[PDB]
Amino acid sequence: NYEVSEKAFLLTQSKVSIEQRKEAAEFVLAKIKEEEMAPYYKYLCEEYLVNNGQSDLEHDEKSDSLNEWIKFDQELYNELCKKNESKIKELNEKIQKLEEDDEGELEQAQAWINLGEYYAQIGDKDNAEKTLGKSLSKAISTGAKIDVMLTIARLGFFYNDQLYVKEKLEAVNSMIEKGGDWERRNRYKTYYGIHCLAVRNFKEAAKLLVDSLATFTSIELTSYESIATYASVTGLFTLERTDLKSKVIDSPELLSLISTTAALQSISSLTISLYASDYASYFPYLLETYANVLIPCKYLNRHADFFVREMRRKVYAQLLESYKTLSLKSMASAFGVSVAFLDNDLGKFIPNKQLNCVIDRVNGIVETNRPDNKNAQYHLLVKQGDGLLTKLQKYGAAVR
Amino acid sequence: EQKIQETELKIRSKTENVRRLEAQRNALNDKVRFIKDELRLLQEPGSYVGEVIKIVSDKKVLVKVQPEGKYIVDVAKDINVKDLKASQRVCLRSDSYMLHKVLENKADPLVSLMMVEKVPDSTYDMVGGLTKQIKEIKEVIELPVKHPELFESLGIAQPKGVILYGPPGTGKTLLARAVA
Amino acid sequence: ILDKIFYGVLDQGNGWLYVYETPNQDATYDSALELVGQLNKVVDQLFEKAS
Amino acid sequence: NHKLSESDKKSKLISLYLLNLLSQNNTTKFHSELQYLDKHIKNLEDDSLLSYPIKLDRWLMEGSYQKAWDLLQSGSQNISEFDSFTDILKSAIRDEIAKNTELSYDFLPLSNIKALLFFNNEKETEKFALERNWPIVNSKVYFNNQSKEKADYEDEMMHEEDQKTNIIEKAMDYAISIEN
Amino acid sequence: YFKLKKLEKEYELLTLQEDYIKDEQRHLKRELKRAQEEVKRIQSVPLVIGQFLEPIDQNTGIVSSTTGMSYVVRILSTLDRELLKPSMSVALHRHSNALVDILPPDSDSSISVMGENEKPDVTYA
Amino acid sequence: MASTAVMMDVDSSGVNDLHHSEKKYAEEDQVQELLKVLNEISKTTLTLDPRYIWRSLKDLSSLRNQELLNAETLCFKTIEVTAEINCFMHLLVQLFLWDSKELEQLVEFNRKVVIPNLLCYYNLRSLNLINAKLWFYIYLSHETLARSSEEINSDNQNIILRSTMMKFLKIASLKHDNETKAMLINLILRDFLNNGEVDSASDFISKLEYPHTDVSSSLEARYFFYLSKINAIQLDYSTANEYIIAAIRKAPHNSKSLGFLQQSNKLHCCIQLLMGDIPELSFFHQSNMQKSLLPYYHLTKAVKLGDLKKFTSTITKYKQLLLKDDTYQLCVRLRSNVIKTGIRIISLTYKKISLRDICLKLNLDSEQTVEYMVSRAIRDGVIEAKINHEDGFIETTELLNIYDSEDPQQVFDERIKFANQLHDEYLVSMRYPEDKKTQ
Amino acid sequence: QTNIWEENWDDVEVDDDFTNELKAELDRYKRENQ
Amino acid sequence: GVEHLLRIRLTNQLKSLKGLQSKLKDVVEYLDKVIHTILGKLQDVFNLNNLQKALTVKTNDELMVIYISNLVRSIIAFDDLIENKIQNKKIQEQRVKD
Amino acid sequence: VKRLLHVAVSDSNDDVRRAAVIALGFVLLRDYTTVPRIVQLLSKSHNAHVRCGTAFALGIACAGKGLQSAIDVLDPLTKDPVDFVRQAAMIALSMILIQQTEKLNPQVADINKNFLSVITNKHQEGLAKFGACVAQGIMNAGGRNVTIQLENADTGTLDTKSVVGLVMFSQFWYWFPLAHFLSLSFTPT
């Protein structure tokens, strides 16, 4: 499941290297052999289809597909349907015998969960769900309700999905506030920090994501680098430096995995080099991070410029500041970079509503100004009497 | 011609302000009586709770008031003798010493070290690994409990009491409670 | 370590940064937005109940 | 429908008349006449005369007149019948620029303002400035007061600080009181 | 024209019909308030202490008497379920015998009080 | 069959009898609700065919048979009166392109329904049993003309219609002769929106709004909708939008959300454009273009930058769509308005810039028009800055307030004006439950 | 376009990051030229 | 017993005149009574007005938040009754079984 | 009326209001019509006197007239805890109810018996039985064969003497030796 959806994501994102394409489905090629992945690997092969995912032995085979590995065979189905049936048949009478013998309940639910996991291996966003229902139907335990999480987490994030599972996560979480004791809370927070990481988490669960580590990861629903990676980035890109320089300044967590995946090396690291307030070095470390981090990984791509430019803003906002003063030149020039261009997007922060920057172009000079009490007193005030006016009419719609 | 015609529509429109005042009527007068309504009950002798000892054919319920002692006293007409029960929490007409109405009876376990916790909770998985026992337990208890007649179908007398013998102290109670 | 800005704006021609202030405004609608953010939702839900 | 008859300077006329309206300095009706126009662009763009006012307006409306003001000197309709408002318009133009200058500037060289006003003599301007009642020293038009501030009416309402809010309060309090 | 002088004229009544009411409106309005007074005023001091047990419904509950009585009584229209509190030391009307108020305070009936050294005199170790 | 069809009409007439008893609060709303059910059974087949017999026998019923114009016959002074009218109502209803194609037959019949024994005694009696839309909605179709030559002299029927609608505006006696009314205006409004300049809208405005309650929020909103487009080239934006902000949900339309509310929304998008606000089309991406927004997005897309060329190109591309919606007239203003918008963020940030950097952006655009172009900008405010060319220094003001002004408290009076909002309108809706308890 | 991203403000713009790097090189390359 | 008799803001203002009424007169009284130094003692605290500063305007600052609840003040009104009352009506009006 | 209302509205003293309510049905004589709808407010009020003064005027307005509708409003008041109230209500009814009885108005039976009920009742006052016995005797005044008439459509016109006994009887529990004045409006069938 796990690398699937990412190796999916990997090749679905393939831009940089054929490897980006190649190496992912490479496994998936072996993995659709490993598991009968076709039924979504079907639509997975229609997922990145009509980009470079255009070469399949079922869906489409196109030269403009740089990925041929998005291919099938009908044997896969034969393989599948056999495996499928085999799985099915076995569990069927098994479950049917569990039904026959009135054998256990969770034990009935047992093969159900077994029935369930296939559709993860299979890729069926299906029976497993109904199975889960008839698993959960047989659940006398939140520990089986735990499997909802497991199920739903495998559900949503086999496709890297959204809400229902999150809602299910909400649902399955809200049920027992035992939060799987300490743990499923994490699993909750994990995928919650992932659901909400679609596309956001930003300030929100990145904390939580950072908050609990290393307390879980999943294997099939996530790796440990993953959570760390993700948790770092957003939480870093978002959260309070104090926190970050309390926490991601370093954590035994980090200290453990620092450069261990090499892959990061940057996220906080070269941002700790930002957090080392270079001018340049980080400004390369950006894309040095970006393409090594954002493009590669699921949400990390789709959100994109949220980061970019926001750390790119971040570098303006707390690091370089407005700045309250100093000729833009000494910034824009004495930092050995494009005066105008840098200044432009930098100036594009003037109306971004975030700049207390006060910026001249001619004199290449920058200033600042208190933000008074504005903050968010009435500004949003409008929204709700409106949100009432919704009701207020909706009410006035009640009537008869 | 139409001279006085639409003159209706003048007062014909007035039909509303009526109904405002009509809305107001309720909107007002409801309060008044209501606010007034409390005034009476503020005059009360009291209301006796009671602990029914029992009834008899007499339709005088036989009762011990909690601070008082036992009195056998008539009921409210609005209740049966049959709906009644002993110990029953009831409004007793204070000085009439007849049932004013019935309350929720309160009851009831006891103490003396014979006391009853009623269907306790645990789940057997939590000492898990014993399940061979648990299965045996289920077989000696749950399956007897869940479907005794399987054993009646077999035509035995299924276990009415059970033994467990071996390593002590796992939360052994859990073994019992979780099944129970 | 306000926290926290580092900081104003250095100047080449010269050699120094700027300054500012902390105390902005009290947290009020911040406090309140949440309420009126909260209010409708359940009452929307409540409208739903009545519907 | 009127295809039954049709003619040409009908374009010119309304062209003149839109330009008239334009000179008549009535913005919406001018434009809403373009809306009242039946075929608009179909009519409009195909007539330079019709093409004057809005393209002018484009210029005119926001307040850079440069080519527009230039255009109307070169305007074939100005060159044909239109020089009527062209004169008016020139003045009509500059008075806004005058304010725009007055807005943009306090102290402006008499050259620039003339350069702005497109005048040859600056005493041409000097009238206007003094006709505008503009503070001036040698060679430079000054604006000490760019505006009319104070000046009688628009008073007794806002500042309506508490009074309105007091009444609002009062109202709100009646929205509190008449809530009865 | 015609039938209205018959008909229409009869609506002048319906005009008055309003005019009857908004008059009587203020009545209940005031009749409220001076009455709104006393319904408040029925509370009073020289009471008997007790302990609240449990509401039977809103404006009905059982309390405990310090004298050992425990009975269905009436209560504040003031407290309901919110401000009504699960058990309370309570202000009790005597013969109306009803709940006058909850009591925040005190301690030391019997029982026989509570041992209190506030700021005990012993350091540990 | 035809029965059940008529059985509905029967039950409707049954409720029409509830009108033949009295208003019609039910009956109209019934008829309204029935008008919803009007879709279901329908045809004319033995509907209209037995209807003649079901009507039989009234003259106008036989007159309406001219609209029937089929094989009916078969067999079947009071119970036949407003029913027939209510069927003449259905006669209208029949014709939606339901049970019809060319209503120009019925155009005449409209009059020959509306005029005879109709459009007469109904002041309080017929309660918007007139649907002048359904009246005109006919002509609405026909106004696909083109064809009619207009037609005629130009186009006098629609003229006469306006006059005939005026003949109701006449008949609109404010005796509750209302509901339908400003449709007649909405017509004339959109009749101005056909060829015209609404400005008698002001005179229309002079009279009234569709007062008041009993009108469908739809038309009440559809009022605003046009009433917006008044202020459109009246160049009031807020109030226009305020009309939209009085318009949209708000008259619940969902069915009419599709084609119709886009129109509404289409205009709505234009507003903040006129105000330079460009709200987030992030939703306006969806339930939108497809057929409505995205040129506005393209506009917004431009209007975010406001690059005249790139801007114009949008228009240049979408002009016909603009043209289709006559939104073309717009956006020509907003061209430099965004250019000026950018001007504000060019770093007006520095308390100046010098002339020729703030010229530089125009030295990116044009020169010494700068003088104008900035005065062109400084003219309207839209930026607050100063200059003197004597200095050649373009001085960009603070734009800075510690507010402590009434400014938010204006926005409170706003709130405050809603402090009653339903708070009052509860007392409005306090009557209905409790005074219908009195019945 | 999908359903719920982080939405607003607005789509921003595109071709910046690499453009930046393209310039970050050039910038630094200019700073190499420096 | 007083309660047996009779049967928010404004009055607070209503003395606005009283002293100020006699006051200047009281001057003109003594002014044209004798036509003391105490009066001049009264004087200097007159300037204690036209005093108003931007300091004044800080009021609205305060007055801003002062209004926050104005919705919320009635928001619960804006919420509950006729919802439930309709429900209660929907209860009551649908009650109507036999 | 508006005054009288607001007066009754605006007075502390209840009897005045009671009175003020009573006197209404005089200026309200010519239409007994809305008088029930009129009192339908004052029918329902915290105060007895209000609810007292109700009984008379309506009982007066329809005295020579119909409207069990009007009547039936008062029957709750006939149960208002103050016997003096129902006593009035007792009266007020019978003032209307003469000649109207027996399945024309079936209610009279109770109403009569109510008196007798009360007249039987020891727990009902000599307030209660007072009006009861009187209201009985009211219905039975003039060998029960006589009626009560004012502004008589017979003449179409008022007679003050009809009024007098009422206003005379008005204060009675005040000053008892009065009601014999009520003999005035006694009218032959």
Side-chain angles (χ1 to χ4, degrees), chain E residues 51-116:
Chain E
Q51 170 58 246
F52 178 75
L53 292 175
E54 179 184 4
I56 298 170
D57 68 17
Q58 303 171 342
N59 292 339
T60 309
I62 179 168
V63 300
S64 298
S65 172
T66 58
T67 64
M69 293 193 292
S70 296
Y71 290 109
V72 182
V73 295
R74 292 296 175 274
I75 62 166
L76 283 172
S77 295
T78 301
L79 309 190
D80 189 11
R81 51 191 191 98
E82 307 77 358
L83 299 178
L84 171 64
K85 299 173 184 178
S87 179
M88 291 302 303
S89 299
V90 286
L92 294 172
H93 279 143
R94 289 190 296 270
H95 305 295
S96 287
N97 197 31
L99 165 55
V100 180
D101 180 9
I102 61 173
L103 305 173
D106 73 14
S107 63
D108 284 347
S109 64
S110 299
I111 299 89
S112 56
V113 304
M114 58 193 74
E116 287 178 348

Side-chain angles (χ1 to χ4, degrees), chain F residues 139-146 158:
Chain F
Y139 305 124
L140 168 60
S141 66
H142 300 292
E143 288 181 349
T144 48
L145 61 86
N158 298 334

Side-chain angles (χ1 to χ4, degrees), chain D residues 1 28-29 32-33 35-36 38 62 64-66 96 100 103-107 116 118 179, chain F residues 195 197 233-234 326 333 336-337 340 371-373 375-376 379 387-390 423:
Chain D
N1 66 349
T28 286
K29 291 179 301 302
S32 296
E33 184 65 14
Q35 184 59 61
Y36 174 79
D38 298 351
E62 300 170 347
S64 292
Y65 301 82
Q66 187 60 63
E96 306 171 356
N100 307 345
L103 290 176
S104 301
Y105 307 109
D106 285 343
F107 301 176
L116 291 175
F118 293 148
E179 183 175 359
Chain F
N195 60 346
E197 182 167 358
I233 301 170
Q234 297 300 322
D326 188 3
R333 300 183 291 271
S336 296
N337 297 344
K340 291 182 294 294
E371 299 178 345
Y372 298 134
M373 294 176 76
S375 295
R376 80 184 261 167
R379 173 171 183 166
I387 311 169
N388 289 287
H389 298 290
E390 73 193 351
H423 183 63

Side-chain angles (χ1 to χ4, degrees), chain A residues 145-155 184 187 221:
Chain A
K145 183 186 69 66
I146 282 170
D147 294 346
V148 176
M149 300 184 72
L150 287 168
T151 308
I152 66 175
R154 286 185 300 280
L155 295 177
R184 307 287 175 268
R187 298 193 180 172
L221 294 169

Side-chain angles (χ1 to χ4, degrees), chain A residues 240 242 327 330 367 369-373 375-377 380-381 384 391 394, chain C residues 3-4 6-8 10-12 18 20-21 23-25 28-30 33 36-37 40 43-44 47:
Chain A
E240 285 304 321
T242 306
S327 159
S330 296
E367 303 305 319
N369 170 47
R370 254 244 242 316
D372 272 335
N373 59 359
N375 296 273
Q377 214 104 2
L380 307 190
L381 173 65
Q384 288 166 333
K391 294 178 175 170
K394 177 179 75 181
Chain C
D3 65 337
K4 47 280 121 249
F6 28 57
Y7 172 21
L10 12 127
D11 287 359
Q12 201 41 58
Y18 234 11
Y20 223 40
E21 268 209 89
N24 235 131
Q25 208 35 41
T28 51
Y29 179 82
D30 303 345
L33 169 67
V36 192
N40 58 344
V43 182
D44 282 334
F47 178 88

Side-chain angles (χ1 to χ4, degrees), chain I residues 61-79:
Chain I
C62 293
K65 296 173 180 175
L67 277 67
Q68 301 77 0
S69 62
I71 295 293
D72 296 345
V73 181
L74 302 179
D75 294 344
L77 291 177
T78 66
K79 296 178 179 180

